[PDB]
């Protein structure tokens, strides 16, 4: 399919950036996670980044470490996540859906089979957090054989060779890291660089989404003004889940208010 | 792009977030440079000799083998400063950190021995050391935690995941992903992403080099086999490395069998796990059917790394090394036997290697065989564990 291409084309037509929340699938349970995700969409999410619970999320700070732990407390498995994904797609035909994976869950019972399952449930992209471009070949090849975009990461100090590789190998969107370190709203990254955003454009890369530390409307607006196609926010969204575990209705209300505010910041 | 091969056959690699690739490339470059630098080599040799106490003895154990055709030597890493082989490679990594201009060290530890080794090297060489340790390990390793603190290291409990070694490994990498510009990650075994399996081997290879010289001196020929326990694989690859090209020398690695392979409660991923990708490497590991990482179990807390170094997986695949397992009860019997018959208290880790050697002798007592067991550490730390079990008997 061409869900990211279609989205960016539509957003470009409206001089608009993308706002893309991250949540952990099945945090804090399957039924509530499905409701959370429907709320994110109704409040204006342009695409989703969805984490499959993993025992050792080594690119994630405490907020998302805790989301994984909550999903495991609810007994959430990758199989259940694929069930959730199929239902999400059945409800929402056009929204781009990206997975945040760790390598072992992809490689576990066969790389090709993993990407085939993604295609079957209607996933659009897969970002494997612990696979650098240098190790990416079997993952990106399998992705493309199954019409899945492999997402690659552009660190803020990326050199020319790396920019060229990320531009060539990735599809769907280019992940623009705001800073070194791990996920977390407590650590704000940078306005990227004209250089990076411009070089990616020069090399015809997939449109950039800035992520890590994005927790406020002002940062979304800033990312888009800098030339990114949009922004990803995870910890700030997950914190609302964490804060409101005992209050599921209030959780959804606060998620709605926050996502609405973040999305508004992306509009021209 | 790298200067050295990051793989051993299919095993190994550099499976880290993109943000950490420059750190690994920097470390590899510094290592390759150091390896060609006679001054670096002389500084390392000086610390090993005058601070750590190398060369370590090679002890012929005559009482243990009486009445058989086995001749058994123990390579005495138990006599190295700190009481285990880990001291060798921490000194080399500390000097690499200095070479690169870094003033801070990060380390992970499970049972605490690597933490103590990292702390002592950092104290000596003027580095600020912070050590990640799963909260459950902190609770159960108060002696080692106190040693680390006395040596001026910061110990940081890790409460995430299972609150054990794998979780400390993650936290170390999370820290490094933000701090690499000023801090070096002093990884504690011959595993993780390239270049660590290579560096740790090269900074442990004096074990086998000395063993070869010592056995030639005493016996006039190479060993029939060298035998070492395998946690993550550092002491074993250190013993094996100099003998890899001596095709007649058997290389035997011993994984912990815990309560028995058939119980599932073991730490033997090389022979009984499944290949996965974790901790920066493709290697056999302890994992669930779905691919979640699991703990290793052994009576010896030092053998609880839930995977194995990729060079071991490779040496196994080509048949250059054989890997076996030894249960808790077998290790305990070897521990008792060495104490009573040789007056040496071995680490319970090392007791796994000794137990396999004792089996080689006992199963075939008229087989002529010259064996060397790597005695990776001393067992003072284990006396209560052994006491408590033997009391409940
Ligand atoms: O808003 P924050 O700071 O919590 O960041 C949320 C990011 N969530 S995500 O799925 O895009 C994401 C993207 C990349 C990650 O690691 C990698 F760069 F190494 F690949 C981890 C998570
Ligand atoms: C840590 C330890 C081991 C196991 O680690 P390796 O990296 O496999 O050597 C073995 N023996 C002793 C004494 C240890 O402290
Ligand atoms: N758990 C052991 C060995 C180890 C494995 N990885 C790092 N260290 C120790 O910390 O001493
Ligand atoms: Cl390869
Ligand atoms: Cs705006
Ligand atoms: Cs000595
Ligand atoms: Cs003998
Ligand atoms: Cs092992």
Contact B123/B87 with Cβ under 8 angstroms? no
Provide the residue range defining the domain that includes B102.
8-52+86-204
Is B2 a member of any domain?
no
Give residue for tokens 């690739």.
B21
Q: How many Cβ pairs closer than 8 A exist between chain A and B?
A: 98
Nearest residue to B9 via CA among B311, B383, B348: B311
For residues B380 and B347, the answer to whether their CB atoms sit within 8 Å is: no
Number of domains in chain B: 2
Identify any residues that bridge with A175 across adjacent strands, giving them in sequence order.
A153, A209
Residue B3: inside a domain, yes or no? Answer: no
**HEC per residue, chain B:** CCCCCCEECCEEEEECCHHHHHHHHHHHHHHHHHHCCHHHHHHHHHHHHHHHCCCCCEEECCCCCCCCCEEEEEEEHHHCCCCECHHHHHHHHHHHHHHCCCCEEEEEECCCHHHHHHHHHHHHHCCEEEEEEEHHHHHHCHHHHHHHHHCCCEEEEECCCCCCHHHHHHHHHHHHHHHCCCEEECCCCCCCCCCHHHHHHHCCCHHHHHHHHHHHHHHCCCCCEEEEECCCCHHHHHHHHHHCCCCCCEEEEEEEEECEHHHCECCCHHHHCEEEEECEEEEEECECCCCCECCCCCCCHHHCCCECCHHHHHHHHCCCEEEEEEEHHHHHHHHHHHHHHHCCCECHHHHHHHHHHHHHHHHCCCCCEEEEEEECEECHHHHHHHHHHHHCC
| C-beta neighbour count of B149 within 10 angstroms | 13
Alpha-carbon gap, residue A141 to A131, rounded angstroms: 13
Containing A24, the helix (H) or strand (E) segment is strand A18-24
Q: How far apart are CA B29 and CA B11, in angstroms?
A: 21
Phi, psi of A237 (to 5 degrees): -75, -45
Name A9's Cβ contacts closer than 8 Å, sequence gap at least 6: none
**Chain B residues with at least one Cβ partner in A under 8 Å:** 1, 13-22, 160-162, 166-167, 170, 173-174, 177-178, 180, 276-280, 282, 287, 290-294
Which 3 state secondary structure label does DSSP give A219? helix
Query: Residue A13, Cα to own-chain centre: how many angstroms?
Result: 23
CB B28 within 8 A of CB B202: no
Q: Which two tokens stand for residue B150?
A: 């006395």
CA distance B115 to B174: 18
Whether residue B111 sits in one domain with residue B73: no
Could you tell me if B259 and B111 lie in one domain?
Answer: no
Ligand 2: nearest atom to the Cα of B230: 8
Q: Choose among A165, A99, A158: nearest CA to A129.
A: A99
Identify whether residues B315 and B267 lie together within a single domain: yes
Method of structure determination: X-ray
Element spanning A78, H or E: helix A78-91
To one decimal, the resolution in angstroms is 1.6
Secondary structure of residue A150 in the 3-state scheme: strand
Residues of A with Cβ-Cβ distance to B282 under 8 angstroms: 107
Domain boundary among B172, B204, B236: B204
Give yes or no: residues B384 and B324 share one domain.
yes
- Residues with CB under 6 Å of ligand 3 are B 108-115, 165, 188-189, 231-232, 302, 304-305
In a domain, B69, yes or no: yes
Whether omega for the bond prior to residue B55 falls within 30 degrees of 0, making it cis, is: yes
Question: Is B92 found in the same domain as B81?
Answer: no
Same domain, B21 and B109: yes
Q: Please judge whether A135 and B19 are an interchain contact, meaning their C-beta atoms are less than 8 angstroms apart.
A: no
Of B160, B186, B204, the position where a domain reaches its end is: B204
Angle at B147 between CA B339 and CA B279, to 5 degrees: 90
> Does residue B317 fall inside a structural domain?
yes
What is chain A's alpha carbon radius of gyration, rounded to the nearest angstrom? 17
Q: Pairing between strand B7-8 and A48-51?
A: unpaired
The two three-digit tokens of residue B106, written as one number:
């990060």
Q: Both tokens of residue B194? A: 């390239």
Nearest of B204, B326, B199, B179 to residue B267 by alpha carbon: B326
Q: How many CB atoms lie within 10 A of CB B242?
A: 19
List the domain boundaries for chain A. 1-268
Cβ contact A104–B16 (<8 Å): no
Mutating to test ligand 2, I would choose from B84, B323, B380 the residue with most ligand atoms within 8 A of its C-beta, which is B84
Interface contact B170-A131, CB threshold 8 A: no
From residue A7, give the alpha-carbon distance in Å to each of A4, A18, B77, B199. Answer: 5, 9, 63, 47
Same structural domain for residues B189 and B317?
no
| Strands B70-76 vs B58-60: parallel, antiparallel or unpaired | antiparallel
Residues B189 and B121 reside in one and the same domain: yes
Distance from chain centroid for Cα B269: 15
> Quick one: tokens of B388?
């408590």
* Chain B residues touching A54 at Cβ < 8 A: 292
CA distance B160 to chain A (A): 7
Q: What is the CATH number of the domain that holds B37?
A: 3.40.50.1100
Q: State the Cα–Cα distance between residues B378 and A198, nearest whole angstrom.
A: 60
Cis-peptide, bond into residue B359, ω within 30° of zero? no
Say whether B178 and A181 touch across the interface (CB within 8 A).
yes
Task: Note whether A155 contacts B178, CB cutoff 8 Å.
Answer: no
> Are A131 and A170 in contact, with CB atoms under 8 Å apart?
no
SS3 A232: strand
* CA A210 – ligand 2 centroid, Å: 43
Q: Is the CB of A219 under 6 A from ligand 1?
A: no
Q: Which residues of B touch A61 (CB under 8 A)?
A: 174
- Interval between CA B143 and ligand 3 midpoint (Å): 15
Q: Name beta bridge partners: B373.
A: B74, B227
Last residue of a domain, one of B204, B233, B252: B204
């Amino acid at each position: 399919m061409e869900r990211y291409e279609n989205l960016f084309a539509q957003l470009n037509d409206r001089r608009e950036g993308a706002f893309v929340p991250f949540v952990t699938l099945g945090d804090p349970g399957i039924e509530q996670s499905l409701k959370i995700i429907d709320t994110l969409i109704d409040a204006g999410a342009d695409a989703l980044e969805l984490g499959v619970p993993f025992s050792d999320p080594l690119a994630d700070g405490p907020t998302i470490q805790n989301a994984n732990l909550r999903a495991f407390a609810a007994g959430v498995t990758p199989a259940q996540c694929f069930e959730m994904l199929a239902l999400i797609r059945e409800k929402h035909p056009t929204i781009p859906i990206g997975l945040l994976m760790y390598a072992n869950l992809v490689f576990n019972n066969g790389i090709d089979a993993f990407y085939a399952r993604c295609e079957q449930v209607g996933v659009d992209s897969v970002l494997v957090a612990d696979v650098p471009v240098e190790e990416s070949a079997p993952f990106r090849q399998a992705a493309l054989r199954h019409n899945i975009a492999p997402i690659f990461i552009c660190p803020p100090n990326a050199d020319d060779d790396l920019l060229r590789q990320v531009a060539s190998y990735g599809r769907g969107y280019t992940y623009l890291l705001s800073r070194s370190g791990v996920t977390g709203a407590e650590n704000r990254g940078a306005l990227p660089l004209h250089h990076l955003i411009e070089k990616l454009k020069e090399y015809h890369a997939a449109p950039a989404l800035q992520g890590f530390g994005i927790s406020s409307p002002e940062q979304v607006s800033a990312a888009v003004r800098a030339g990114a196609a949009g922004a990803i926010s995870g910890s700030a969204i997950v914190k609302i889940i964490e804060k409101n575990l005992a209050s599921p209705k209030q959780m959804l209300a606060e998620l709605r208010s926050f996502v609405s505010a973040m999305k508004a910041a992306s509009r021209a | 792009t790298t200067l050295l091969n990051p793989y051993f056959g299919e095993f190994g690699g550099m499976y880290v977030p993109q943000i950490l690739m420059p750190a690994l490339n920097q470390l590899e470059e510094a290592f390759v440079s150091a390896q060609k630098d006679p001054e670096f080599q002389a500084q390392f040799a000086d610390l090993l000799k005058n601070y750590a106490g190398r060369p370590t003895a090679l002890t012929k154990c005559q009482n243990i083998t009486a009445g058989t055709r086995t001749t058994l030597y123990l390579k005495r890493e138990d006599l190295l400063h700190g009481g285990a082989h880990k001291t060798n490679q921490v000194l080399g990594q500390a000097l690499l950190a200095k070479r690169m201009g870094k003033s801070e060290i990060i380390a992970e530890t499970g049972a605490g021995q690597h933490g103590v080794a990292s702390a002592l090297a950092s104290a000596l060489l003027g580095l600020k050391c912070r050590i990640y340790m799963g909260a459950k390990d902190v609770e159960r390793q108060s002696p080692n935690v106190f040693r680390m603190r006395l040596m001026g290291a910061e110990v940081i409990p890790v409460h995430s995941g299972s609150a054990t070694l794998k979780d400390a490994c993650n936290e170390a990498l999370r820290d490094w992903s933000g701090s690499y510009e000023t801090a070096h990650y002093m990884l504690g075994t011959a595993a993780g992403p390239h270049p660590y399996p290579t560096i740790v081997r090269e900074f442990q290879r004096m074990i086998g080099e000395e063993t070869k010289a010592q056995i030639l001196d005493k016996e006039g020929r190479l060993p029939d086999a060298v035998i070492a326990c395998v946690g993550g694989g550092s002491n074993a690859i250190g013993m094996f490395a100099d003998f890899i090209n001596d095709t007649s020398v058997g290389l035997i690695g011993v994984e912990p069998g815990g309560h028995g392979i058939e119980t599932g409660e073991h730490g033997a991923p090389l022979k009984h796990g499944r290949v996965g990708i974790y901790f920066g490497m493709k290697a056999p590991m302890m994992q669930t059917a779905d691919g979640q990482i699991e703990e290793s179990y052994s009576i010896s807390a030092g053998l609880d790394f839930p995977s194995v170094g990729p060079q071991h997986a490779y040496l196994n695949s080509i048949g250059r090394a054989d890997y076996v397992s030894i249960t808790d009860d077998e290790a305990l019997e070897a521990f008792k036997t060495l104490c009573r018959h040789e007056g040496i208290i071995p680490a319970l880790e090392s007791s796994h290697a000794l137990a396999h050697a004792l089996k080689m002798m006992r199963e075939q007592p008229e087989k002529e065989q010259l064996l060397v067991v790597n005695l990776s550490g001393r067992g003072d730390k284990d006396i209560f564990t052994v006491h408590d079990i033997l009391k409940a008997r």
